[PDB]
């Protein structure tokens, strides 16, 4: 019985906006640095992949609400700024978070109503870690294909709020997969 570790970085092509406080953004009440709570990743992934089609979703994330106990096979943690983004921004003196001014127009009135949305800065990188506990040797390939599709969909979609309105597109780079529990090989599993 083995566990496979998938770590990498995700880049905010158009600014990201989670905002657990909300118009704030998720932070640490001490570090005050933006984070992306993993559960948000999980939720977006699930909505997408389920919309791609069901057993497979249950296998991946786990529900156990219909009397069938399977237990989650995927663990997704939150992510953080890498040291790389922090050092670059401090050197270049770039604020971490942008405040976008928005506006809304009443019809039959044509009046202006100002809005404010806190977005994570373009180009920052998040280090994310996924853990896949392969409970069935004879299925893991299938599962990764599915996880691949999930990742792929997200590549052309958004996280968080206003994603239709123009924020939240991300990218995945420098994904490496390593086996960390058990003696199962991971030199052929591939995720972009």
């Amino acid at each position: 019985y083995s566990k496979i570790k998938i770590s990498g970085t995700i880049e905010v092509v158009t600014g990201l906006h989670i905002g657990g406080g909300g118009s704030p953004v998720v932070r640490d009440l001490q570090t005050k640095l933006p984070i992306i709570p993993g559960s948000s990743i999980k939720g977006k992934m699930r909505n997408l992949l389920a919309k791609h089609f069901d057993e497979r979703v249950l296998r991946l994330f786990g529900s156990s609400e219909k009397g069938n106990i399977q237990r989650a096979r995927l663990q997704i943690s939150d992510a953080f700024f890498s040291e790389k983004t922090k050092e670059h921004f401090a050197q270049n003196d770039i604020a971490y978070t942008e405040t976008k001014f928005e506006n809304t127009i009443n019809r039959l009135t044509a009046v202006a109503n100002p809005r404010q949305i806190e977005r994570v800065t373009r180009g920052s990188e998040f280090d994310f870690v996924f853990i896949y506990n392969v409970d069935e040797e004879s299925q893991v390939e299938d599962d990764f294909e599915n996880i691949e599709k999930a990742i792929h969909l997200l590549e052309n979609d958004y996280l968080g709020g206003g994603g239709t309105r123009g924020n939240g597109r991300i990218q995945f780079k420098d994904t490496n997969i390593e086996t960390v529990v058990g003696e199962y090989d991971s030199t052929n599993l591939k995720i972009k």
Partner: peptide, 18 residues
């Protein structure tokens, strides 16, 4: 060691407790 990578506490799978 094996547990190191799974969670502890509560909402383990939700991104807490490695």
């Amino acid at each position: 060691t094996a547990l190191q990578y799974s969670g502890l506490g509560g909402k383990r799978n939700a991104g807490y407790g490695q």
